[PDB]
Amino acid sequence: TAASEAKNSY
Amino acid sequence: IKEYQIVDHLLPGLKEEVMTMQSVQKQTSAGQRTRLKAYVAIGDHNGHAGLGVKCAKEVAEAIKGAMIQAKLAMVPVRRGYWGAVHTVPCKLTGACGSVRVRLVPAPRGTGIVAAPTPKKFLILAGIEDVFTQTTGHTKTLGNFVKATYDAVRQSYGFQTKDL
């Protein structure tokens, strides 16, 4: 779940 | 090879070239403490090249210690073919300081298309055909040869298809 990887540069 | 005589043992008759003598100075209370720094290049003309630097008070003494360092700094030069040994096997660049010297494989006929300084070292290494492009302050001789030396120093690291 996209949340599971949701709890960064360029 | 922590000793300079061993390269003189397995590589006899190393044809010698003093690239340049460069006088440095150290300002002190009395005045300037000047020493002469000499860049020398060694190496038989069959894929072995060496560059060493030493600085001392006497011209003769500095050169003698300079050949030692060039002898200690021994590297193999990988030669190859352009289309069909005379030239580098691929495109290599030597990353000195502001100087960046790039080697491009050249056909059988063309000589060393390069500045006088990297030419004398590229002749020593045993290459006869090469294309070179420079990027930086090439009037700095010491960084010029080091950029040249570095370019061939990495020729035996690029794992090509045949390797």
């Binding site: - | 352009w82 096997p89 691929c90 495109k91 494989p105 690029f158 794992q159 090509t160």
Partner: protein, 116 residues
């Protein structure tokens, strides 16, 4: 924003091989780019689902310049380490190929990228 999946993919591969690698968006060009890179041996989710010491550097070329057959010599001379090692990747009228068969299929077209 993500403009080119191919550009992102190949940069992900190079940084890993410099240091298996993962590519999150998969397209019709990303995968069949690899089939060229695999037949040279260089390489061993409902939402466009998601290395052996040989790859040196693989990169894409920004806007895909139409390549004539006569123009092949200029591109290889620029982007290839030697005359025996690298490989271009071309998208042509007969699929995504490289400079070998596209020279043999007798066609030109746009250029995707390369790999040493």
């Amino acid at each position: 924003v993500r403009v080119n999946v191919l550009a992102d993919a190949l940069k992900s591969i190079t940084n890993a091989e410099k240091q298996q690698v993962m590519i999150r968006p998969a397209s019709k060009v990303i995968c069949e780019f690899l089939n060229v890179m695999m037949k040279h041996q260089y390489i061993t989710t409902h939402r466009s689902g998601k290395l052996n010491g040989r790859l040196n550097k693989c990169a894409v070329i920004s806007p895909r310049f139409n390549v004539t057959l006569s123009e092949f010599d200029k591109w290889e001379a620029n982007l290839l380490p030697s005359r025996h090692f690298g490989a271009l990747v071309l998208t042509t009228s007969y699929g995504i190929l490289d400079n070998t068969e596209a020279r043999a299929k007798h066609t030109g077209g746009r250029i995707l990228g390369f790999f040493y």
